[PDB]
Design a protein around this ligand. Structure first.
Ligand SMILES: Nc1nc2c(ncn2[C@@H]2O[C@H](COP(=O)(O)OP(=O)(O)OP(=O)(O)O)[C@@H](O)[C@H]2O)c(=O)[nH]1
Ligand SMILES: Nc1nc2c(ncn2[C@@H]2O[C@H](COP(=O)(O)OP(=O)(O)O)[C@@H](O)[C@H]2O)c(=O)[nH]1
Ligand SMILES: [Mg+2]
Ligand SMILES: [Mg+2]
Lengths: 119, 423, 424
């Protein structure tokens, strides 16, 4: 199930992040109530700090495609998101030594920056 | 009237000990600070309880050396607030001494200097003791000298640098550190006495008859020669009675302010004439910096005799050397040798390998042959900087790589400045 | 710059690690109960460096290793909290040590590292012992290093990494593991002593005439080398005193910090050494490639920097002469563009069982020979793609192998560049 995104074993979390990344490509622009990674943004704030470098990077690219699937209406709730998300993104995504873990974290911040009215 | 001494890095600190050991014997001052007996209060202050305290600051970015000061023979002599220590040393890196570690302690050090300057009424300036190759000695000093040129800008500052020598060298990068401090300390120093540790090594092997000298051996010899230069300030002689006169007599060019010091006689503890010792001042074997003054022009020359000396013997020995040797001078100089005498005998340390001599002399002469010493450093520097070797250490501790080149150009320009004077 | 935190990881890590603690406990006069029964101040002058009881953390995924240490001679002295051990083993899988199983445990280790660092007057840096062909010592060690590097960036990282050789284990995945680990060490450690099992076997077999060397036999050579290179750190002395100063005078280019250690005289396990060597004899165990702990010929490259440590009562005059001699009589082998690149230091306290000894730490470009051997074995294995499903299954990407392969080859090229460099 989806609740396996917080499962103990890493390779089962790694699935859920890929499963999610599909969801945000393949699900509805209008958006299923199953797309509730807005009104609890603590979820992905947790996922970005995964405690596994490979399953972390996969959570960030799921957050990334989520965070561009949200350029559809109405998502005025991007204020809450920047508060919850970019501190984890900066603290441990930009920080990362991993080439791709960093590159997608910056891209994520970009997408949160243009969610906002200004910088 | 007062002069403040500063000691930076192990070199400064440990030579400091040797000098203040020797100052207290010359002034009959006790290890506890007392005195059963003015001109000497240029260097010492006085407690209400009849105790004589040095006007000195000890600085090291690491306890070990200064810890031995304040648990040793002269632990009582210094106030504990004068002895300042950090925890992480500079690790033979000018960058850490100047930028990374030095900024963490510079303000405490400048503050403790203000406390000694506040006790003083007519402060003259600063004497500064430090190594070249050391990270603390190079980096922190050059920083401290910059900041003293602000907080005390309108007064003198004198250097006592320890020129590096492979025989006691602790680091590969000592040429780097030497060049880097000499660049940034050039504008902020009025006069600077270099001490080649190789010459001091050579002298101790030949004239003191020691196989493998220790630092104590070298520091004692050095402290004897430092005492000879500061004797004029501590006993009220006729020559070099205050810090300005050092620049007046020895510095006819702000940049070229690096005198060669020559000291005779160095007699093992196992008497000579006035003429014999004055000839030894023009013998390279007894110089503090290894070069050949015969290959260079003299800009000035002072003779500081001390002991059983007849002023007429001096004038004979001078005329002997002025006639029977060819000491080339520059045409725009007073062709006359300045002299001063202090009739007190050269004090040695009880136990010292150096013997008590009846008379002694220390010749301070701003010859252009000392450029040879800068050339040796500059060359070693060039070899390593050609491959950017060890440069990442410096750049990774807050230093721009450009500063290497800016320093090297300032050393190349100084080598040209020595050349144009001597042609 | 006072205290050093020590770490040992994996089987080899705790083996040569404990052996090291055995050696320097004796040298400093500490018994297995942790009490001073020495007779000299030069022994407790800098005991605060490695001791408080050792400042040592013991790590392994293999839980058995726990007991192999405590059931050893000085096994009682180590702090019980500083044992941090997993349930299963890594099984020669670097990915399991670096990404999966070793990563799960690494937090527990950092908690103890923090604890020991917390109560240090002034930390110098760290010291890790480990093997590179393993899964735990290499994979979790390198992951531990990076994790410390980022938590303690103001400190030195110093490793005693031992290189795998077919002469000591026929496991063919070791080239993978060691290549991946070298890709880490070149980026993550300030200085690394390259202990080559190839050279340890060749010394026990050919010089010591032991037909079947055991680990204990190879570990004897290692523990004696370690006490030798750490002599400056553990006793009072002017030169190469602390970890940073050492690295400052040893490492001219950040990536080229792989030292070829070697020492003399080479003794067997508890054999009798009636005839004590002379100073010129010791000095002539430097270029003597049969004394190098790494399987490289110093004749085939050039020394960038050299540190010599002479232990025992002897003529400081003669040592200076012999070192000044051997340098200029082989002037073409020491790089010219680093003047006074060789540095010598003497310690009056000799090692156990010897009247005189001499250890020879060298940044020699010949070390490229060592990295050549590892890479060729790696490439032979990697071109047929053998055993890759082990690593990839644990979350690794095939790309990583290519990057580590290329990065080690850049490291070899760099050594070759400075070997062919000229001062002109
Ligand atoms: N003549 C003389 N030279 C010394 C003495 N102490 C150190 N040196 C020389 O000074 C150079 C640098 O060493 P240090 O002055 O101790 O270095 P430092 O100033 O303490 O700086 P760091 O130790 O790097 O923090 C070396 O080349 C030594 O040969 C001394 O007591 N007398
Ligand atoms: N010198 C030495 N090498 C060892 C020892 N034990 C294992 N090795 C080497 O280390 C490699 C195996 O790694 P190991 O440390 O046993 O695996 P780990 O426990 O997962 O770190 C092989 O190259 C072995 O030759 C030892 O006690 N001494
Ligand atoms: Mg120092
Ligand atoms: Mg094991």
């Amino acid at each position: 199930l989806e609740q396996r995104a917080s499962h103990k074993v890493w390779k089962a979390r790694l699935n859920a992040y890929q499963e999610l990344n599909n969801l945000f490509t393949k699900s509805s622009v209008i958006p299923n109530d199953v797309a509730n990674y807005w009104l609890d943004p603590e979820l992905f704030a947790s996922y970005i700090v995964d405690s596994n470098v490979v399953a972390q990077e996969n959570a960030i690219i799921a957050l990334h495609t989520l965070l561009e699937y949200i350029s559809q209406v109405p998502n005025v709730s991007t204020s809450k998101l920047r508060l919850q998300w970019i501190p984890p993104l900066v603290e441990k995504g930009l920080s990362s030594s991993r080439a791709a873990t960093k590159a997608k974290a910056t891209d994520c911040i970009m997408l949160l920056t243009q969610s906002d009215t200004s910088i | 009237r007062e002069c403040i001494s500063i000691h930076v890095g192990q070199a400064g600190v440990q030579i400091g000990n040797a000098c203040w050991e020797l100052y207290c014997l010359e002034h009959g001052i006790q290890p506890d600070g007392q005195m059963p007996s003015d001109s000497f209060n240029t260097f010492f202050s006085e407690t209400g309880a009849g105790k004589h305290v040095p006007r000195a600051v000890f600085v090291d970015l690491e306890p070990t050396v200064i810890d031995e000061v304040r648990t040793g023979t002269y632990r009582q002599l210094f106030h504990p607030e004068q002895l300042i220590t950090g925890k992480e040393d500079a690790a033979n890196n000018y960058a850490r001494g100047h930028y990374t570690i030095g900024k963490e302690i510079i303000d405490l050090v400048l503050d403790r200097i203000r406390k000694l300057a506040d006790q003083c009424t007519g402060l003259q300036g600063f004497s500064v003791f430090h190594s070249f190759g050391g990270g603390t000695g190079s980096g922190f000093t050059s920083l401290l000298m910059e900041r003293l040129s602000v907080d005390y800008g309108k007064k003198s500052k004198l250097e006592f640098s320890i020129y590096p020598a492979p025989q006691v060298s602790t680091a590969v990068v000592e040429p780097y550190n030497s060049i880097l401090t000499t660049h940034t300390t050039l504008e902020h120093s009025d006069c600077a006495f270099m001490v080649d540790n190789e010459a001091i090594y050579d002298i101790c092997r030949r004239n003191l008859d020691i196989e493998r000298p220790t630092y104590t051996n070298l520091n004692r010899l050095i402290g004897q020669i430092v005492s000879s230069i500061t004797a004029s300030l501590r006993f009220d002689g006729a020559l070099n009675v205050d810090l300005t006169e050092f620049q007046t007599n020895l510095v006819p060019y702000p940049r070229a302010h690096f005198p060669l010091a020559t000291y005779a006689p160095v007699i093992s503890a196992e008497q000579l004439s006035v003429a014999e010792i004055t000839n030894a001042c023009f013998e390279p074997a007894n110089q503090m910096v290894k070069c050949d003054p015969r290959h260079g022009k003299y800009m000035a020359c002072c003779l500081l005799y001390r002991g059983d000396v007849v002023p007429k013997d001096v004038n004979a020995a001078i005329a002997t050397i002025k006639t029977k040797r060819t000491i080339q001078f520059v045409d725009w100089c007073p062709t006359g040798f300045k002299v001063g005498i202090n009739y007190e005998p050269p004090t040695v340390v009880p136990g010292g390998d150096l013997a008590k001599v009846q008379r002694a002399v220390c010749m301070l002469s701003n010859t252009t042959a000392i450029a040879e010493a800068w050339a040796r450093l500059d060359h070693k520097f060039d070899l390593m900087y050609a491959k950017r070797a060890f440069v990442h250490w410096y750049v990774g501790e807050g230093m721009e790589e450009g500063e290497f080149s800016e320093a090297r150009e300032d050393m190349a320009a100084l080598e040209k400045d020595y050349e144009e004077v001597g042609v | 710059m006072r205290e050093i935190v020590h770490i040992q990881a994996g089987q080899c890590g705790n083996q040569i690690g404990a052996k090291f603690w055995e050696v320097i406990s004796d040298e400093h006069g500490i018994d297995p109960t942790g009490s001073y029964h020495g007779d000299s101040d030069l022994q407790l002058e800098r005991i605060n460096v490695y001791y408080n009881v050792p400042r040592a953390i013991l790590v392994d995924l293999e839980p058995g290793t726990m007991d192999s240490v405590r059931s050893g001679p000085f096994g009682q002295i180590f702090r019980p909290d500083n044992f941090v051990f997993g349930q299963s083993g890594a099984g020669n899988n670097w990915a399991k040590g670096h990404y999966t199983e070793g990563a799960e445990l690494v937090d527990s280790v950092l908690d103890v590292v923090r604890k020991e660092s917390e109560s240090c007057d002034c930390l110098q840096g760290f010291q890790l012992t480990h093997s590179l062909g393993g899964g735990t010592g290499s994979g979790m060690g390198t992951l531990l290093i990076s994790k410390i590097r980022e938590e303690y960036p103001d400190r030195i990282m110093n490793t005693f990494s031992v290189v795998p050789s077919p002469k000591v284990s026929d496991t063919v995945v070791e080239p993978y593991n060691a290549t991946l680990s070298v890709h880490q060490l070149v980026e993550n450690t300030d200085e690394t002593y390259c202990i080559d099992n190839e050279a340890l076997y060749d010394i026990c077999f050919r010089t010591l005439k032991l037909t079947t060397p055991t680990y204990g036999d190879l570990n004897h050579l290692v523990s004696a080398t370690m006490s030798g290179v750490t002599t400056c750190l553990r006793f009072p002395g002017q030169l190469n005193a602390d970890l940073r100063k050492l690295a400052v005078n040893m490492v001219p280019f950040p990536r080229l910090h792989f030292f070829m250690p070697g020492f003399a005289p080479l003794t067997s396990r508890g054999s009798q050494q009636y005839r004590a060597l002379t100073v010129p004899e010791l000095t002539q165990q430097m270029f003597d490639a049969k004394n190098m702990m790494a399987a490289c010929d110093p004749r085939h490259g050039r020394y960038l920097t050299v540190a010599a440590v002479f232990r025992g009562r002897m003529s400081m005059k003669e040592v200076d002469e012999q070192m000044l001699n051997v340098q200029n009589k082989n002037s073409s082998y020491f790089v010219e563009w680093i003047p006074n690149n060789v540095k010598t230091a003497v310690c009056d306290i000799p090692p156990r069982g010897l009247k005189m000894s001499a250890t020879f730490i060298g940044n020699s470009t010949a070390i490229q020979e060592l990295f050549k051997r590892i890479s060729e074995q790696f490439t032979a294995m990697f071109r047929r793609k053998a055993f890759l499903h082990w690593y990839t299954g644990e979350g690794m990407d095939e790309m990583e192998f290519t990057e580590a392969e290329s990065n080690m080859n850049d490291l070899v090229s760099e050594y070759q560049q400075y070997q062919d460099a000229t001062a002109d």
